[PDB]
Symmetry: C3
Subunit: 364 residues, 3 copies
């Protein structure tokens, strides 16, 4: 099952008592069945309360989404700064080469961020450039020679090397006094920022797309947001009670990357007398699962479930269901055609299709 990505598929970049930064292996590492995802990578960050991820930039375009907790994300530009107070469901597009740092200002909640990255110099391959100098990594400033550094900073190398080069890793503890000072002018999201070119936006800013007693699905697309339109990506989040089933359906043109935030679930995927291929998998918290465009899929929540999804090639994507009383494509095919396509009669076919009176999310 090349579409299932569990912990063995992630790679740790930085880890200590305060935080864990890791990246998913290249989507096309194992199988070449996901070739059109070669330009993308998934980054995962988790940190304890009152912590700071040191300043750095990446040679990759970034789309950040907060799964759990609160974060003060501060973009450090060459002539100014932009800080944002981001909470669960907030997303922010950070251009490649933008220096930034992240603070978890909460006193009790851990922070969990997921980042969709799009490398610039090589397809799906990139590096993180930390300005800081720790035991886990040397500052990129150390790449320059002594004579160069002396001329640039116009000071003796013994001083530069003492002040700059001379912490355990890239995630460090920060005082409540410093957190309070670093959170002063942080801007947050609002229903107005839904269509902003630079400000953060929440995935639950509007009414959910699907919503009943068993589940809810919220979504932000390239249609309302300029940031997402340029990346041609949609973002969605789903909540399902234990025992609920996300009815059979397929995405018309979007390649969907699933990230399990909370809970467990069984997922069935269908690929292609010509036989169909049955891909099966049991998903756990933090697992990743890829749904190729056009492939029918089903998600069954084993416990209270919450997952997020990044939709690549998103523009005008359509969700077509094969069961249920709403958005059921089969119920749109005329009886004359249904009768020729299936063995049963036009009557048996319609009676069957009407059996399930609920839609989207049903009892498993």
């Amino acid at each position: 099952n090349p579409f299932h990505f569990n912990s063995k598929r992630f790679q740790t970049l930085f880890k200590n008592q305060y935080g864990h930064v890791r990246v998913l292996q290249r989507f096309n590492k194992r199988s070449q069945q996901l070739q059109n995802l070669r330009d993308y990578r998934i980054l995962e960050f988790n940190s304890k309360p009152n912590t700071l991820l040191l300043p750095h930039h990446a040679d990759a375009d970034y789309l950040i989404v907060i799964l759990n907790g609160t974060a003060i994300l501060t973009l450090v530009n060459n002539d100014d700064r932009d800080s944002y107070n981001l909470q669960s469901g907030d997303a922010l597009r950070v251009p490649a080469g933008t220096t930034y740092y992240v603070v978890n200002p909460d006193n009790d909640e851990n922070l969990r961020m997921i980042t969709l990255a799009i490398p610039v110099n090589k397809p799906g391959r990139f590096e993180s450039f930390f300005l800081s100098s720790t035991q886990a990594q040397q500052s990129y400033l150390q790449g320059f020679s002594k004579n160069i550094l002396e001329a640039s900073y116009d000071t003796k190398f013994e001083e530069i090397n003492k002040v700059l080069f001379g912490q355990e890793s890239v995630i460090v503890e920060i005082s409540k006094k410093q957190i309070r000072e670093l959170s002063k002018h942080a801007k947050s999201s609002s229903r107005k920022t839904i269509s902003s070119e630079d400000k953060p936006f929440n995935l639950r800013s509007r009414d959910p797309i699907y919503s009943n007693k068993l589940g809810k699905l919220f979504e932000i697309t390239p249609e309302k947001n300029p940031q997402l339109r340029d990346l041609d990506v949609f973002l969605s989040v789903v909540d399902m009670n234990e025992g609920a089933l996300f009815l059979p359906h397929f995405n018309s043109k979007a390649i969907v990357v699933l990230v399990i935030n909370e809970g467990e679930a069984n997922i069935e995927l269908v690929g292609i007398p010509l036989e169909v291929r049955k891909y099966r998998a049991e998903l756990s918290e933090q697992d990743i699962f890829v749904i190729p465009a056009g492939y029918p899929v089903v998600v069954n929540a084993t416990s209270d479930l919450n997952f997020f999804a990044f939709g690549i090639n998103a523009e005008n994507n359509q969700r077509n269901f094969l069961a249920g009383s709403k958005d059921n494509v089969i119920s749109q095919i005329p009886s004359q055609v249904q009768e020729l396509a299936f063995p049963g009669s036009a009557k048996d076919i319609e009676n069957l299709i009407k059996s399930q009176s609920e839609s989207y999310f049903v009892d498993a």
Copy 2:
């Protein structure tokens, strides 16, 4: 000759007394000389009078063109239906993930369709998802487990399997009564739909680009059509009497994919003391020939010829001729430069270039 594609290069996907679905091999299969066409595939469909292509969707963007006959192409959306009555020269873009079926409503004419496909999940590799259940293929619904299907459809698996799972292939016969019932409300093209975002358009909707006693060429480009602009593709159709010659010319930036509909022709292609490379081939009905951008080419009709062409990387493409009285690039080169580029004198060069008083199509 890596640019010539005869019948041995097509792959049969489905075939019986009523129809034949075939797909051309990957363009860069044999030679890596067509590397920039690896994202595209050509699909061919031919069916007898009064038949139906069963409902399915593809994980690939589709641009459909009718070469012969009539078709009732019905797009089945999750909330509704859209059916079109298409005749020769009509084209329609069908987005990936769109379920549809095709009917040949005519009583005597065979339908012939050509589709330019653009796979979503893998470069130039895709699959067809048929909802139907026949001897040639199982429904993709059979990919889900019994328990899942029971909960989804709220019915015992014995009923589902009986009505939905339980025809010889994907092409079947259809009564005239049913054809009549499925042909109601079908919308057709007209001079106005040339610039429609979703309606079909005819390649001969307007005056031909080139036209004389020996030939005609019609063309629709991204400049007037939004569907074509989004794909950055142009469509053209050519008619040439037996013994006519399509004068030497090259496409400035478009990579042109030719498909012979009727007739036969000899084609010469020129690639690159540095010597030129001569590519020769004799074309027959249904053959395909690729003309890389910038490569001089000539088409000589051995018999009454009719062919269609899909032009990739089409925006602002230009046809530059090297002979004839119209659009001859050589006649635009100042005599001072002509004399320095060619061994002959300025007078000898001007006299030679002027001998051919006809343009575009001349006697072979």
Copy 3:
């Protein structure tokens, strides 16, 4: 150092007493670290005064820049001609499949053209199609058969072969009389064509971006020019006095291709737990690639002049790590600076403020 391209990396296509056409090898030939430049190729042209580059077209989109001298670039369309008088710093985008010829109208100056090419049929691979017939190459017209050519031109093959098929190479001498007649209606650039859809534009048409006693940098981006916008490319030219240093900085998202026009320089680049230190000494005509986000510094060993093609340019930012202007480090709060660097907040500020100059400083 896979980022350095010296004379050994170029390929001669045509050469004689009057001119020299060469093309840089595929960027991803030696290494795979430059995979996202695989669709690009750099073409170089140098010619003597009073010379003509014979008419031809290429199956590649072109972005032409004049580094030295003057040129009459004439685009020959199927229905007419477009002529342009190009001088130093002038640029013009020429669509794939456009026939054209180049004249060096000057009586004393050598012409130097650099061309960024984007091949159409194959990533980074293409060919030049010359109409001319010389000892170095046959006309692409010879690719057709006698019977086709006879029907096409409506003339016996003996005449066609005599008049067209039958000069040593594709660069030839041309009289001053012919040059004056061939320059009759050439349009030139001006501050008014900086953002032109079809006309040539000059890199120094407006005030430089950075400018002090030691150096200068001019730049034209997709934001102002439509031709550059469609290619998502920016063009810049730099002038540095001997002993000057282009302060440490990095391009946020643009992959920059450097071309040395005059002078020499030492360049330091840093990649990525230890950092990788790429070093190189640059000479005239050398090429050097600077990946996006990679800190870099340029030290002029002698009076220096170089041009740069910036790929993936839209909204590119230049972030410096030293100096009194556009310094990213000076924008990092002291609470954070103090946590990322071992020195104290006071020691970090004093250090960052020591350099009162910006962009270009004393090496």
